[model samples]
Target: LPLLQQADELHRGDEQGKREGFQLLLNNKLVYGSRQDFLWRLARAYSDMCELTEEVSEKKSYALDGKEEAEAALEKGDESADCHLWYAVLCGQLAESIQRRIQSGFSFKEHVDKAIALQPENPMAHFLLGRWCYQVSHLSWLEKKTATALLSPLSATVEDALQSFLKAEELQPGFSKAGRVYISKCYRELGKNSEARWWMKLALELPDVTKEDLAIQKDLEELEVIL
Candidate 1:
């Protein structure tokens, strides 16, 4: 109980705390480490570490590790919403590596669908779904051709992404800077420059809670240049 409690406290702290917590749990696997929740928490901690890191290869490796562990636990009957959510998140992160982009994108969509089905009210799930749709909908002609040749045609639309983003906003208004930014992106893609600017300003006004927020802020500034 002490180790578990300690891990919880550490995870509740800042990014460094989460990294340490993950290491602590990983190094001592003899305690209550056999639990499904423990596995998911480990996955979460590792995923957080991946996000906070600045190095691209490090980020990919951490996400790939998290994805492996998450899948192992899922195969062992860890069917919780968080399990699916973390797997989806890791898959999406892994897509940044390029080598596995197609496979990771498909896996990301699969797990995101499961996460949303398990927890329809989860704003994060909706946000992820929106991103998936947006990316697929915006794929270039060559990209689409390659994917189709692989027998995995990306099936999504800007309108579909917008709807998912709007649903997430309705569930938890302003919960994600990326969500608002993507909403603005969807409008811009649809040629609604005025609506796009409105959402971009909303994104700029949102609070920056994490390192990712700074990147989102940078995006907001760039979008502002076009407005």
Candidate 2:
């Protein structure tokens, strides 16, 4: 249980803590239950490191690798919501790291959709789905063109993404600063700067416990200047 405690602390700790914690989990093979909860936790810890760190390539390498482990665990017929949720979440992180939707012949959307289907009322599921929508809707022109040529056509608008974000907030009020940041970004994309500023301010007012919150803190300040 000490390792678990250490893992938890590192997970909530700084970026360095996340990196060290993830490696500790990685080196020690803690396989518990049919669903492999320990492995999922390891994957999540790696994901947290990837999210917070600025070392793009290194973080992404770890994320995609963790994603594969998560996928392999899920394919073993584990029906637990945590299995599905982590798999989906890892897929998203991997996709964002590479800046693409289709990966190894599978799309992030597919995994997230499965996660949502498995747990309709799950707040994280809705939040990830909404994040996906927001990212897909705001793809750059070259990215959009590449996606259309290589993958299925994506046609998500700012409005579409906003609806999902709103649903996520309704499900879990103030659960994540990133959620509010995404809503603020959606408003900015739609040219509603006033609404965007309001949401950004709201996000700034939220507790800054995570790296994402810190990032949003900086983002709010930068956005205020432009708004």
Candidate 3:
């Protein structure tokens, strides 16, 4: 329990913590790879490292590897929320490789939504859901055309996305600064400039923690012209 708890602690911390924590979980793979708890956490670690990594090759490597790890975790048990959520994240990582919507019709959304249903009030699940909804809803015109040609017709509204973002905030305030940026965007997208600016200020106030946190800061700054 201590090892697991510590693993979660490091992973849940900042980038340095995750950088160290990723190897910690991986080193235990020989003994704990088959353990559902360990497997889910590793799945998550790979995701953190994937996003944290700078190189494109390294990013894809983490994506494919974590995808396998999450699948293995799911094989052992499918009733939990972590496996599905991580699996969803892995799929999204690979989505850029032309498998995006293909992964959506019955894939990413299914798992993320399932992840939330399985564990209501989990910040990760809600964050994923909101992020997914935001991405789909904010697709560019070309991407929207691509969706029309693609198999599943996935269209999301900012309203749905906003609710999920708000839910994530409700369950765990400031859980993800990235989510905060999205919450700000969602409000702005819906023509509520006042709420968006308020949210953006709060998001900008947070300290940078992870790679995404750093990225989110830049993104937050980028919103200045529009907001």
Clashes of 1: 0
Clashing pairs in 1: none
Residue-wise lDDT of candidate 1 within 1-227, one digit each (tens)? 67767888987898788889989878876765577777777787778888888898898889889888788668757458888998888888777733367777887888888888889999989988998898888788887777777655777999999999989999999988888988898898799999999999888778876666767777677788877
lDDT of 2 by residue, 64-120 (tens): 888876876676765666667777777766666333554521456676677777777
Question: Backbone clashes in each candidate structure, one number apiece?
Answer: 0, 0, 0
lDDT of 3 by residue, 158-186 (tens): 88888998898899888888888888988
Name the top TM-score candidate. Answer: 1
Lowest summed lDDT window (length 10), candidate 1? 94-103
Q: Global CA lDDT of candidate 3, please? A: 0.83
lDDT of each: 0.82, 0.74, 0.83
- Write down the TM-score for model 2: 0.76
What's the lDDT for residue 16 in model 1? Answer: 81
lDDT of 2 at 209: 65
Compare the candidates by lDDT and give the number of the best one: 3
